[PDB]
Design a binder for this molecule. Sequence first.
Ligand SMILES: CCCCCCCCCCCCC/C=C\[C@H](O)[C@H](N)CO
Ligand SMILES: CCCCCCCCCCCCC/C=C\[C@H](O)[C@H](N)CO
Lengths: 245, 242, 242, 48, 49, 297, 99, 49, 58, 58
Amino acid sequence: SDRVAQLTIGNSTITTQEAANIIVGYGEWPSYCSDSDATAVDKPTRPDVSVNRFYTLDTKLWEKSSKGWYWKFPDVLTETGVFGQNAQFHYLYRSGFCIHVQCNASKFHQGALLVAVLPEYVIGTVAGGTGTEDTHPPYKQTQPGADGFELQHPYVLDAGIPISQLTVCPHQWINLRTNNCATIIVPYINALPFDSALNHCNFGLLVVPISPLDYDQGATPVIPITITLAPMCSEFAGLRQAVTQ
Amino acid sequence: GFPTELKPGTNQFLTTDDGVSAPILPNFHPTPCIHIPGEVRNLLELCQVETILEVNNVPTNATSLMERLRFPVSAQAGKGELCAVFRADPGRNGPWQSTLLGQLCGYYTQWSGSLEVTFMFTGSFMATGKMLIAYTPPGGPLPKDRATAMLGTHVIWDFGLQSSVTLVIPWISNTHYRAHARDGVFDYYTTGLVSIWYQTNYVVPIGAPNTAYIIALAAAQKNFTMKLCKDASDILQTGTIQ
Amino acid sequence: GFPTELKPGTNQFLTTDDGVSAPILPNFHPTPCIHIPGEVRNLLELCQVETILEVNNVPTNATSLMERLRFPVSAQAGKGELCAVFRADPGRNGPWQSTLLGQLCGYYTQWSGSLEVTFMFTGSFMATGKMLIAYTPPGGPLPKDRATAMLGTHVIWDFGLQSSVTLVIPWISNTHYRAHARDGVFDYYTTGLVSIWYQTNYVVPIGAPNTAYIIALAAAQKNFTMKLCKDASDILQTGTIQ
Amino acid sequence: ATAMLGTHVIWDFGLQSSVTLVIPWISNTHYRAHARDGVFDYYTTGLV
Amino acid sequence: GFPTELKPGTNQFLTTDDGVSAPILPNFHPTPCIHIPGEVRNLLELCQV
Amino acid sequence: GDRVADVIESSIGDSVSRALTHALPAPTGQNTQVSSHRLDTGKVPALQAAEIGASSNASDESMIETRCVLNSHSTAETTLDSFFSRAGLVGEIDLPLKGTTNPNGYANWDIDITGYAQMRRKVELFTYMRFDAEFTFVACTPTGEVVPQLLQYMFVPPGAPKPDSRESLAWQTATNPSVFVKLSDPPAQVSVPFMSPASAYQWFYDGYPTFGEHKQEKDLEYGAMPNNMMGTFSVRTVGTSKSKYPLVVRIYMRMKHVRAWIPRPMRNQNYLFKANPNYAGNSIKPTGASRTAITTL
Amino acid sequence: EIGASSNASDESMIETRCVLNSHSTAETTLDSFFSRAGLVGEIDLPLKGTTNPNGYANWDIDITGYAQMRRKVELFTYMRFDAEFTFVACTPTGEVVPQ
Amino acid sequence: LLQYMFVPPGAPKPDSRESLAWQTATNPSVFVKLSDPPAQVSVPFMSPA
Amino acid sequence: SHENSNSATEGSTINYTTINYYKDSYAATAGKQSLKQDPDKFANPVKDIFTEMAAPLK
Amino acid sequence: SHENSNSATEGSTINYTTINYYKDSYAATAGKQSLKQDPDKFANPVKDIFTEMAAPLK
Ligand SMILES: CCCCCCCCCCCCC/C=C\[C@H](O)[C@H](N)CO
Ligand SMILES: CCCCCCCCCCCCC/C=C\[C@H](O)[C@H](N)CO
């Protein structure tokens, strides 16, 4: 009665029989932009069900040596379904998200992933190793798209900050002996009421194994982690031709 | 002696400090103020008056400067040809510098609001035509053709007794205010583009000129405001003014 | 001229002095504040959020740093063996430096309150076990055996569906506040020790790993407060930041 | 990825052995005649 | 600028002057005072022992 | 007018942010209530489930037998303003005579507080911050000496002309705010408002400032936030001829009327560059002190 | 041709949403714009010089000698106001002397 | 020109006239000249006792 | 206070709120102006006013 | 006083008590903040709240 759950939105329904409750980031639900916070004057389009549904974008394989991955929002969806289309024809976009990371195993496997949401996840480089070179991450590393991107130095989140303190961000854990998924709901986070779904990534999703995957020889070794997400309260404005970047 | 303690700032002369300072002429009463027409109270009053936009900012020889004040239209080949384009950025280098709006805009760091450009057709009375004028919000590059241009905010102008038409450039921004846009990172604050296309064609009967001009007037809408008073980019002085 | 007399302090610039100083931009109104989720009001709000405690602070090579985030447990020999230990001093060098609590703690000279450490077992579902976790108040040296450890404040953890267990480190101090403890006389302000022992054993059936990890999360209780704002011990800069 | 854009259900194995996929009535016409290859493919319901 | 005129004494540091001076630690609240026996209030109390 | 049911019962447009939590007054630390032994089944405060993502709710009273303690310990010093409203170094400007940098008698400092670690690390604890600020300018010769020299400090907002010489016409300062002060005077000090076009300055912007292909050349612009670029601060000796003395100006900033959103992990690797989280990949150090064994001190 | 500016509003040219605009118009008032001190005069008192080697100087009050200021005022034809004058003196190197 | 800085126990102690500690981002510091009147401040009761 | 009314804006259609310490009001601070505007004076100084919706010339 | 409302914390859910001598409120002192806190926002942002006494997962 808390281990079992069902998420239905749009024409998509998700189930789980081993849940660990739901986190509502920063203790707040996605809402539409108010007439007093708003600044742009054009009447927005709120496509509803065609874009506020569950998109299942990726699957990574968890290995005894995996480092961890991250995806950027809304970058992951800008080229998918009706949502991607609206994000392209419009300058302005705002929305919330319901994230559902899935990973099941067996009662004989073990391991724990940390699933967190980090607003304004700015990536850094190793500065030529020595730290004397002012290098910067390439577009494909900052907006990895749907395939996400593997962390090079998980301990400092590839940004000079301790992953040990990452729990200060909305999160959940997928500890195999306990659950098989994390569900986090995120409201719009920005200093503006609207923004470009192309130039700016409001937050990054991180999935990092903190307690390594393990099992005896003979148990299924292919342990996938799948990413499913649904935009919520999607609003768009500033219409023109489609643009991909 | 009443105990006081001096704090940092003491003795500084801040040019914008609004203070009190000794009157040099005690009991002096100024000449009274008679009525004078045209008193202005706020610069925004002036930002709503249309002034000429130099869309045709190409000629530079002294004898052709008057030509920047108007651009042409003429009979075409019916391919929805492009007539002219320009950036909507009011505080940016370009056509807007000819307008008082753009000028006053230079004395402020940030602005917010909708803009309007009214086009007046000055052809003969026998000339007809329909034009498609489009505002292309940020992110969309210069429309390659009229079909692309059409997906943005636009107005279709029909020539008739009403010589003019108004294109509203609605405030469509992510931020509440925009700083002056210029090449580089500040292109972030760009407003977008305006493109003018032939919707049909400039048609005229026998005996009327095949070329006519359009004059563009621009100003700001009533939701328009400015913030952060700064010095303008131009200083109209070379050496000492004698 | 109204008679005043200047007192000592005059002209000094005290970095923490809360005063008034001339506004550079008269009549300037800031951009309005829209709603933004996650507003924090007091640092104590953050001191109650559990962050990972690096109990296993031994590995130092880049490629093994992730290992400090968790410590192990495995099948033993039934002698109530010791699993791990660490000082409870939150503002002292050691495991606590990995926690945000320890970090924020560095910006204050004194603190007071109870603490809590929650341990999450990440073994397979088939693994069972009972552990004895004990907080040893000041004065008691590192327990030589589980029998000694047991005389202090402790919790006996049974593995089951509830993956985690919480050890409360109650505020037990002679003074109302503690300053940061460190070797030397300031060891006076030490909080004490935490020891983890096998109450029974880590049992697992055929087919399940013989080694599993525990993750420790730590934060402060609601009676926790900090005093005397100071600069932290670390300065993350070598030469000039360019 | 393509399949996912349509109406779907994500099934998690657990004590509840079963899961139900609803195939909602989504048709242009009020009734459908039996669909079969050819023009009557007009009345097709779709795919699972 | 409100008109003032400085008088003699200005800038002196009188060791017995009872004045106000800027607090270095804003919003700092001291450790509370528990009860302690033997509080003395006036030296005369001691001159009678 | 609306008529079809789904439209009527639609929640599309709800602008109220349903909030699951709310702030309560907390002037002092919490008190401890008396507690006695409990020998019950079903009741298990000690056991938690961290996977959920919430911190342990177990209190002292439920884990040991507690006495009563009236806690009057103040929580006032940990408020944003208490923590941030303390002036700290954010800028240093050199005006040497015979030099490689500013031998021309003036200097332009792009307002960026990320040049100094102490201050930088504090602010970066949050993602978004809104506040007013008090600036204090401390000037002297390189030996810490005071000389009878007159300076002019001018705030040059973005778009205003930047002085290019000690004699630039820009120094007329007809509209910009300027401060004329002597080194002999106490340090100059002013108040500045919240000037961003955004509702808050943000120490971290995960994005690009412009549209287009983001090729190698334009990668230096990743994370560039115009909303944080408040302008330039220019200083000059006030004269036509060069100043007789070399100078240094230290800029101190004290935040006030502060508001912050979205706390984040605190920097644990040395800073290398302004506005850019780059860290030395070869010197990745653990957050804190280390030991030889987990079973030893 | 009439001589008036366009009365067309946003609402009538496109479908607009509602926006509660609280953007202040205070900074564009005459005093906000003009009540900021600026350079209007410069006077030289050199020792051995061609101009004022006699120890004094007369400056005919005229603010049109400097462009920044001049351009602002000339935006209007007529102006009435009070003024605050500030005199900053020093040697040509920006030095302070006991004079 | 001098700088006086209060360094509470636990805060980093300057080891040179150029120590980074002098940034004084959180500690209270007083900048004053010898030519100025003597600096003067108020301090609270800071013991944990 | 009880001072002279010698300010340049005495008898103005806008209310100022200022500070002063001298018998002459022109010594007072700039203060806060009143926020009224009259664009029409310049943007729409026509005798017979026309509507937005209408055709300007009829 | 009768000043401008240009402080960075205008329209804040906490009451400040400050001092000022200028028409612009951002010039005012830092003052005293209100002492409210909302830990749950970060420590307990769960949808379905569970009790201490209960077993978190059921
Ligand atoms: C008389 C002139 C005084 C100079 C006035 C300086 C005003 C500066 C406003 C403070 C802005 C806060 C700092 C903002 C951003 C950071 O420094 C960096 N740009 C972040 O990348
Ligand atoms: C103690 C003496 C202080 C000097 C007092 C100067 C008072 C000057 C009154 C300001 C007059 C405004 C400027 C008037 C006219 C322009 O400068 C030009 N003449 C226009 O051609």
